[PDB]
Amino acid sequence: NSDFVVIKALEDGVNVIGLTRGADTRFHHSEKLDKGEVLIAQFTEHTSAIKVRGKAYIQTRHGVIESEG
Amino acid sequence: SDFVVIKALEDGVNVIGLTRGADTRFHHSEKLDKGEVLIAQFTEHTSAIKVRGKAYIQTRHGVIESEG
Amino acid sequence: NSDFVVIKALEDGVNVIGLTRGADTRFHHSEKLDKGEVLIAQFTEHTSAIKVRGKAYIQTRHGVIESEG
Amino acid sequence: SDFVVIKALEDGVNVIGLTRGADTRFHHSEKLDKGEVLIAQFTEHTSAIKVRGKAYIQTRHGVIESEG
Amino acid sequence: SDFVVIKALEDGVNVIGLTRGADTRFHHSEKLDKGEVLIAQFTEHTSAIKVRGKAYIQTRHGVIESE
Amino acid sequence: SDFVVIKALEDGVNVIGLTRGADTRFHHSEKLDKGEVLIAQFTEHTSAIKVRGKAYIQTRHGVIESEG
Amino acid sequence: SDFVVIKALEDGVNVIGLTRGADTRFHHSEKLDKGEVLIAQFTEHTSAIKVRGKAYIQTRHGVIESEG
Amino acid sequence: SDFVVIKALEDGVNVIGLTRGADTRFHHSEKLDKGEVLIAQFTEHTSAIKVRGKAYIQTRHGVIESEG
Amino acid sequence: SDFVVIKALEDGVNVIGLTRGADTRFHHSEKLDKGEVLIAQFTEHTSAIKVRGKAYIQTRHGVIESEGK
Amino acid sequence: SDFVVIKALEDGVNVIGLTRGADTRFHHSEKLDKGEVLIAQFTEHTSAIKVRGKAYIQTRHGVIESEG
Amino acid sequence: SDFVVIKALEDGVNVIGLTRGADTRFHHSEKLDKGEVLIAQFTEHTSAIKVRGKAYIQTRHGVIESEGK
Ligand SMILES: N[C@@H](Cc1c[nH]c2ccccc12)C(=O)O
Ligand SMILES: N[C@@H](Cc1c[nH]c2ccccc12)C(=O)O
Ligand SMILES: N[C@@H](Cc1c[nH]c2ccccc12)C(=O)O
Ligand SMILES: N[C@@H](Cc1c[nH]c2ccccc12)C(=O)O
Ligand SMILES: N[C@@H](Cc1c[nH]c2ccccc12)C(=O)O
Ligand SMILES: N[C@@H](Cc1c[nH]c2ccccc12)C(=O)O
Ligand SMILES: N[C@@H](Cc1c[nH]c2ccccc12)C(=O)O
Ligand SMILES: N[C@@H](Cc1c[nH]c2ccccc12)C(=O)O
Ligand SMILES: N[C@@H](Cc1c[nH]c2ccccc12)C(=O)O
Ligand SMILES: N[C@@H](Cc1c[nH]c2ccccc12)C(=O)O
Ligand SMILES: N[C@@H](Cc1c[nH]c2ccccc12)C(=O)O
């Protein structure tokens, strides 16, 4: 039942990086998206922070935001 | 528990479920032909969903479109 | 207490297909609706995704969408 | 639990409960004559409901009509 | 747990409760005469409610009328 | 738990509690005279309420009026 | 739990609590003089509240007025 | 758990807690002088609150004013 | 659990927490000077809060203003 | 669980966490330079937060501004 | 559990997590370069978040901007 974010890649090679939940913080996975693909990604037991690199249109419960490459 | 609506706008749209857990990889790909709709939840096994291909998508945060 | 989808068949032979919950994903049931019949179907312990094939008017909590045969 | 309102607009409308669980079959059909209203929940035993015949239906997602 | 409001618009209206559980049958029918109102929940014993006769009904999904 | 508000619009209005459970019968009838208000919950013992006599009624679903 | 606000519009208004349980009787009568306000919950002991006398009442369902 | 806001509009206003339980009696009377504000919850010990004297009151149901 | 916002509008404002339980008395008085904001919850130990002095107050029920002696 | 946002409008804004429990004193002070933002929850150890210095503050009840 | 969205408006923005509990200290500083977006929860380990550097911030209370150094 956690929140989720919507990431639409606006160019090739966007990275959606999950950061580890817990006392330690590191990248545990980078999912690479190509232009026009959409990832819908939850917060989870393993992921408590999500970093987006590259150009993407993003939706979350607080509205739209855009990352730039 | 949340769900995503996916409407295929062309043949071969691929809805890809990513594994929940410490590891991340795809565990299922459900292909849709033009005009079919898939309403898919997040689950004990799927904590992220990727859409490839042209599709019209509804989530609780609104509509979004994938481009194939 | 789970969410549900309303499906109204707009032609004969519409299939509402339930996909299994869990590590295994497959179709476990396909409900045939003929023109003008309505099915209101929940997500369940056994059904964690629902596929609609054929021409149908669908309502979810996200609004209306239409499937095309 | 959510519920659905079905108002029959002709005689012989059927409101059909489908079994919860790994098996899916009809377990009951409640017949409604014109102008009767049935207000029916989802339950431990009923995880999908089908309506046949002409009726005005209300759910949390709005009005829909079934036609015979 | 949710409830239904029924107002009888004529004499003889029946508000009928249907059993929760694997089996479905009527376990009670409450008769309403004209102008009487019944407010009735879903319960451990009642998972569906049928209205027969002319009445004004309100639920969470809005108004509907039986005839 | 939900409640209903009843304002008696004439003397002798009866607000009648119906028993929760397998059995359905009246366990109590509260008499209201004109201009009296009763605000009454659903409870462990009361799972349906009946109003007889002229009254103004509010519930979560809005206003309704019973007539004598 | 839900609560009701009652403002006495004249002297000697009674806000009466009816017992929760199989039995229904008055357990307490709170007298309000003109202009006093009582804000009163539903509780383990009180599952219905009756107002006698002229008062302005607010509940989650909006305003209603009891009259002498 | 809810609360009520009381602003005293003159000296000597009393905000009175009534005991939760089978018994209803006062328990505490908080004196507010003019301009003072008390923001008071419903609690394990208090299930009804009376205001005596001139005060501006806010609850989840809106504004109401007591008069001395 | 709910909280109240209090902004002091002059020096020497007191936000007083009253004890939760059968006993009612002041257990703490927090002094605020002009311009300072206190955001205080209701808690296991505080079930009523009194404000003495000129202050601008927000709660879930809206704005109210205390006036000093 | 609730949180406040604090934006420092000058150097040396002081966000002060008060200890949760029968005792009240501050257990931590986080200073912010001009333009920095702190987003801080109510927690097991903090049940009141004081802001000293010029800051722009957002909470669930709207915007408020501390002045130094 | 709540999250905040942070979009860096210049290079070298820091998103800093403060420890939950009786002890308060920084336990992690996530550097964002311009145009990158971080969506970060409150967690069992982070009960406060500080942003330093020019960034556009969304929370459930709306938009706020941090201003750089
Ligand atoms: N296996 C990952 C999948 C995931 C969810 N959200 C993510 C965000 C970024 C990267 C991976 C993910 C997890 O359960 O946490
Ligand atoms: N058996 C899968 C079915 C599923 C649900 N949502 C999905 C999204 C994509 C692919 C598969 C799925 C599950 O329970 O997780
Ligand atoms: N027996 C199935 C019935 C069902 C509910 N929703 C469905 C959607 C599609 C197909 C079947 C169903 C279940 O409980 O899961
Ligand atoms: N005994 C059935 C009654 C029922 C509830 N909703 C229904 C919908 C359709 C048909 C029967 C029902 C059950 O509890 O599940
Ligand atoms: N002793 C009754 C009181 C009651 C509550 N709501 C009612 C409606 C009608 C008649 C009595 C009541 C009970 O707890 O159920
Ligand atoms: N004893 C019944 C009373 C009841 C509640 N709602 C109803 C609707 C119709 C008939 C009876 C009822 C029950 O608790 O279930
Ligand atoms: N001791 C009573 C106090 C009370 C609350 N609400 C009331 C309404 C009317 C009369 C008394 C009360 C109780 O806990 O129930
Ligand atoms: N010790 C009292 C404090 C209190 C809260 N609300 C009140 C209203 C009126 C008087 C006292 C109170 C209690 O916890 O109940
Ligand atoms: N130690 C106190 C801190 C506090 C919270 N809210 C207050 C209101 C007024 C005075 C003190 C407080 C408590 O946990 O209760
Ligand atoms: N491992 C950290 C990750 C994190 C979440 N939100 C943060 C905010 C700032 C810094 C780190 C984080 C945690 O679970 O708490
Ligand atoms: N360790 C502190 C961190 C904190 C959260 N909110 C605060 C507000 C002010 C000062 C410190 C804090 C705690 O978890 O409580």
Complete DSSP assignment for C4-15:
EEEEEESSTTEE
CA distance H49 to H32: 14
The DSSP secondary structure of I24-54, one letter per residue, reads --EEEEEEE-TT-EEEEE--SSEEEEEEESS
Ligand nearest to the CA of K44: 10
Residue at token pair 């409308």: D13
Beta-strand runs (E) in A1-69? 4-9, 14-20, 27-33, 38-42, 47-53, 56-60, 63-67
Interval between CA C30 and ligand 3 midpoint (Å): 9
Please tell me if the CB atom of residue C5 comes closer than 6 angstroms to any atom of ligand 3. no
**Of E15, E11, E19, E41, the residue nearest E29 (C-alpha):** E15
Q: Which of H37, H41, H60 sits opposite I47 (nearest CB)?
A: H41
- The values of phi and psi at residue B11, to 5°, are -70, 150
Question: Residue F57 in contact with residue F4, Cβ under 8 Å?
Answer: yes
**Mutation for D interface: E47, E57, E60, E65, most D CBs within 10 A:** E47
Q: For chain E, how many residues are written?
A: 67
Question: Residue G66 in contact with residue G28, Cβ under 8 Å?
Answer: no
Q: For chain I, how many residues are written?
A: 69
CA angle A8, A9, A12 (to 5 degrees): 165
Edge-to-edge, what's the strand order for the sheet holding F55-59? F62-66, F55-59, F3-8, F37-41, G46-52, G13-19, G26-32
Q: Where are the alpha helices (DSSP H) in chain K?
A: none
Secondary structure element (H or E) that encloses residue G21, with its range: none
Question: Residue B40 in contact with residue B6, Cβ under 8 Å?
Answer: yes
Question: Residue G52 in contact with residue F36, Cβ under 8 Å?
Answer: yes
CA distance D64 to E2: 21
CA distance G9 to H66: 10
Question: Residue D48 in contact with residue E59, Cβ under 8 Å?
Answer: no
Looking up residue F36, the CATH number of its domain turns out to be 2.60.40.50
**Of E47, E3, E40, E49, the residue nearest E21 (C-alpha):** E47
SS3 I63: strand
- The technique is X-ray
The first and second tokens of residue E12, run together, are 């003889």
- Give, using CA atoms, the residue closest to atom 11 of ligand 3: C18
* Contact assignment for F57 to E34 by CB distance below 8 Å: no
Interval between CA C45 and ligand 3 midpoint (Å): 9
Q: Which amino acid is at B56?
A: Y
Query: Which residues, in sequence order, are CB contacts of E45 under 8 Å at separation 6+?
Result: E17, E19, E20, E27, F21, F22
**Of I17, I3, I11, the residue nearest I51 (C-alpha):** I17
J18 beta partners: J26, J48
Interval between CA B49 and ligand 2 midpoint (Å): 9
Q: Which chains are adjacent to chain F, needing at least 3 Cβ pairs under 8 Å?
A: E, G
Over its C-alpha atoms, chain E yields an Rg (Å, rounded) of 12
The first and second tokens of residue C67, run together, are 């499937």
The DSSP secondary structure of J17-68, one letter per residue, reads EEEPSS---EEEEEEE-TT-EEEEE--SSEEEEEEESSEEEEETTEEEEE--
Q: How many CB pairs under 8 A join D and E?
A: 67
Q: Percentages helix, strand, coil for chain K, rounded to the nearest 5?
A: 0, 60, 40
**Mutation for C interface: B3, B19, B20, B57, most C CBs within 10 A:** B3
* Contact assignment for F37 to G21 by CB distance below 8 Å: no
Interval between CA E7 and ligand 3 midpoint (Å): 35
Residue at token pair 């898939």: B38
**Of I46, I7, I55, the residue nearest I26 (C-alpha):** I46
Q: Which domain holds residue B14?
A: 1-68
CA distance F4 to E58: 13
Distance from CA of C51 to the nearest CA of B (A): 5
Question: Residue F14 in contact with residue F28, Cβ under 8 Å?
Answer: no
CA distance G52 to K4: 52
G46 beta partners: G19
Question: Residue A68 in contact with residue A59, Cβ under 8 Å?
Answer: no
Residue of A nearest to B51 (CA): A38
Q: What is the atom index within ligand 4 of the atom nearest the CA of D41?
A: 6
**Of K8, K13, D44, K9, the residue nearest E20 (C-alpha):** D44
K interface with J, Cβ–Cβ below 8 Å: 1-2, 4, 18, 20-22, 24, 42, 47-52, 54-55, 57, 59-62, 64-69
Q: How many CA atoms lie within 13 A of K26 on its CB side?
A: 11
Q: K15-47: string of b/e by CB count within 10 Å (b at 16+)?
A: bbbbbbeeebeebbebebeebbbbbbbbbebbb
CA distance I32 to C6: 57
Question: Residue B33 in contact with residue C69, Cβ under 8 Å?
Answer: no
F interface with G, Cβ–Cβ below 8 Å: 1, 3, 5, 7, 17, 27-28, 30, 32, 34-41, 43-46, 56, 58-60
Residue of K nearest to A69 (CA): K35
Q: B39-53: string of b/e by CB count within 10 Å (b at 16+)?
A: bbbbbebbbbbbbbb
Ligand nearest to the CA of K42: 10
Question: Residue C55 in contact with residue C26, Cβ under 8 Å?
Answer: no
* Contact assignment for F7 to G66 by CB distance below 8 Å: yes
Q: How far is CA J31 from CA A65, J37, K42, K55, in A?
A: 29, 10, 20, 19
Query: What total of structural domains would you count in chain J?
Result: 1
CA distance I43 to J3: 15
Please tell me if the CB atom of residue C16 comes closer than 6 angstroms to any atom of ligand 3. yes
Q: Which of D1, D30, D37 sits opposite E57 (nearest CB)?
A: D37
SS3 B20: coil
The first and second tokens of residue G16, run together, are 């009466």
Give the dihedral sign, CA B17/B20/B22/B27: negative
How many whole angstroms from its chain centre is CA F17? 7
Give the dihedral sign, CA A64/A69/B3/B5: positive
Question: Residue A17 in contact with residue A33, Cβ under 8 Å?
Answer: no
